[PDB]
């Protein structure tokens, strides 16, 4: 890289665009710029996340189906995270998702940023804008966009994607949505929610929103000072993650320790979000997780998020409120209002979930 590129990447004021870490990584710096150093710790945990087989889950043989339903129910209660295998998503499609996204991140910055973002429109390539000097930046580049419903797709964003990536993403969206609905429907059965009689789970997600985050984590020279994706719990319904290459990075919090997730070949990693925990009246758990970086290999992933529609009324499903499981969370806000409230929230204090507790 040339000296002007270096200055553009490193001499950053508040209000400037967060720079590309894939570009920063080419500078091969001895120490990472100060903004990537995490300022404010749990130990590492061979206990691994459960595996759920979708063929078993959908088996026409009731004993097979019931066993897998017990496994799903267990994983959602006790782990909040599970791998899915025999998931029905064609191997060729998965290969194309991997190759086209690898292809995409290997394009020039000019080619990755052809979409003209509207003021306040944060979709496409980019982590956003620098907020303050004490803001910590993730060691990661991102491409984020809404994928369902169709009218939430930014048409000019979609038109500026390479054609094979766009077509593959469109197919992947459909398969991810189908898979999410298989899982929502089975979670509803595991919870004994009679969707015909009462306001259940699946009806909230069937016409809900879907979004994708494509993530590129370059190698980092000081991987014990930086983070790929800061510790968080997912806000919405069900997340389905594909790890694109064989580089480990995803870690989940279990009993005050960090546990590595090594995705299986031909597996997706699925987790419960905060809104899903609420809807289940705390029976299913949304778990803290993070992505770490390393000094030798880039890591890639794509996460597909399945959330309520913006006007879905959120609360614990009524048949899950019982004398043995009393109502833990408030009811009655729309999903869109919860999203907006969480953006402000309270500077100091508690998690979104704890803020919603009765």
- Positions in 217-236 near Ni ion (CB under 5 A): 234
* In the complex, minimum distance from the CB of residue 232 to Ni ion, in angstroms, rounded to a whole number: 6
Number of residues that bind Ni ion (CB under 5 A): 1
Whose Cβ is closer to Ni ion: residue 189's or residue 254's?
254
How far is residue 264 from each of residues 48, 52, 178, 196, 261, measured CA to CA in Å? 11, 12, 21, 37, 9
Query: Whose CA is closest to 239, among 210, 279, 202, 214?
Result: 210
Contact 124, 145 (CB under 8 A): yes
CB of 239 vs Ni ion, minimal distance in Å: 6
Dihedral of CA 112/308/274/335: which sign? positive
Please, are residues 45 and 258 in contact by the beta-carbon 8 Å criterion?
Answer: yes
Between 81 and 184, CB nearer to Ni ion = 81
In angstroms, the CA 208 to CA 53 distance is 25
Region for 23 from its dihedrals, namely left if φ exceeds 0, alpha if ψ lies in -120 to 50, beta otherwise: alpha
In the stretch 231-260, what mask flags binding to Ni ion with x, by CB under 5 A?
---x--------------------------
The answer to whether the bond into 291 is cis (omega within 30° of 0) is no
Residue ranges of the annotated binding site are 217, 232, 234, 289, 299, 301
Taking alpha carbons only, the member of 73, 90, 45, 5 closest to residue 262 is: 45
Per the CB < 8 A criterion, the answer to whether 162 and 125 are in contact is: no
User: What three-state secondary structure class fits 213?
Assistant: strand
* Residue number, 138 or 234, with CB nearest to Ni ion: 234
Nearer residue to Ni ion within complex by CB, 53 or 234: 234
Query: Closest distance between Ni ion and the C-beta of residue 248, in Å?
Result: 16
Residue whose tokens read 């290969």 = 95
d(CA 207, CA 191): 21
Q: Which letter does DSSP use for residue 93 in this model?
A: H
Shortest-Cβ-distance residue relative to Ni ion:
234
Q: Which long-range contacts does 185-189 make (Cβ < 8 Å, 24+ apart)?
A: 186/57, 186/69, 186/72, 187/72, 187/73, 187/76, 187/280, 187/284, 189/69
Summarize the annotated binding site for Fe cation as residue ranges.
232, 234, 289
Least separation in angstroms between residue 85's CB and Ni ion is 21
Query: What string marks each residue from 90 to 119 as x (binds Ni ion by CB under 5 A) or -?
Result: ------------------------------
Of the pair 72, 303, the CB lying nearest Ni ion is at 303
Binding-site entries for 2-oxoglutarate: 217, 299, 301
Angle between helices 91-105 and 163-190 (to 10 degrees): 130
- By beta-carbon proximity to Ni ion, the closer residue of 20 and 301 is 301
Min dist. Cβ of residue 241 to Ni ion (A): 8
Nearest-approach distance from CB 300 to Ni ion, in angstroms: 15
CB of 264 to Ni ion, least distance (A): 19
| CB of 27 or CB of 342, closer to Ni ion | 342
First to last CA, the chain: 55
Nearest CB to Ni ion, comparing residues 100 and 234: 234
Shortest Cβ 234–Ni ion spacing (Å): 4
Under the rule (CB under 5 A), what is the footprint of Ni ion? 234
């Amino acid at each position: 890289s040339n000296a002007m590129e270096k200055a553009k990447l490193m001499k950053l004021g508040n209000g400037m665009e967060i720079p590309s870490v894939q570009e920063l990584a080419k500078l091969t710096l001895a120490e990472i710029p100060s903004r990537y150093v995490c300022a404010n710790l749990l130990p590492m945990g061979h206990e691994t996340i459960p595996v759920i087989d979708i063929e078993n889950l959908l088996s026409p043989e009731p004993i097979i189906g019931k066993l897998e339903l017990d496994r799903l129910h267990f994983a959602c209660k006790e782990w909040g995270f599970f791998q899915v295998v025999n998931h029905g998503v064609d191997a060729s499609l998965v290969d194309s998702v991997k190759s086209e996204i690898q292809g995409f991140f290997n394009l020039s910055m000019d080619e990755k940023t052809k979409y003209e973002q509207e003021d306040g429109d944060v979709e496409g390539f980019g982590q956003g804008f620098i907020e303050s000097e004490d803001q910590t930046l993730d060691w990661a580049d991102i491409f984020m966009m809404f994928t369902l419903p169709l009218h939430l797709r930014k048409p000019h964003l979609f038109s500026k994607l390479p054609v094979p990536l766009r077509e593959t993403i469109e197919s992947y969206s459909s398969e991810m949505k189908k898979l999410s609905m298989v899982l929502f429907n089975k979670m509803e059965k595991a919870l004994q929610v009679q969707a015909a009689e009462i306001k259940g789970m699946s009806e909230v997600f069937i016409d809900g929103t879907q979004a994708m985050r494509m993530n590129y984590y370059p190698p980092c020279p000081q991987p014990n000072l930086a983070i790929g994706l800061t510790s968080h719990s997912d806000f919405g319904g069900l997340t389905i993650l594909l790890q694109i290459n064989e580089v480990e990075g995803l870690q989940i919090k279990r009993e005050g320790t960090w546990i590595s997730v090594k995705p299986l070949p031909n597996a997706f990693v699925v987790n419960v979000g905060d809104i899903l925990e609420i809807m289940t009246n705390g029976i299913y758990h949304s778990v803290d997780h993070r992505a770490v970086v390393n000094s030798t290999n880039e890591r890639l992933s794509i996460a597909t998020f399945h959330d309520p529609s913006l006007e879905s009324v959120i609360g614990p499903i009524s048949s899950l409120i019982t004398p043995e499981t009393p109502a833990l969370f408030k009811s009655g806000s729309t999903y869109g209002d919860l999203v907006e409230e969480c953006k402000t929230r309270k500077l100091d204090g508690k998690s979104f979930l704890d803020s919603m507790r009765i």
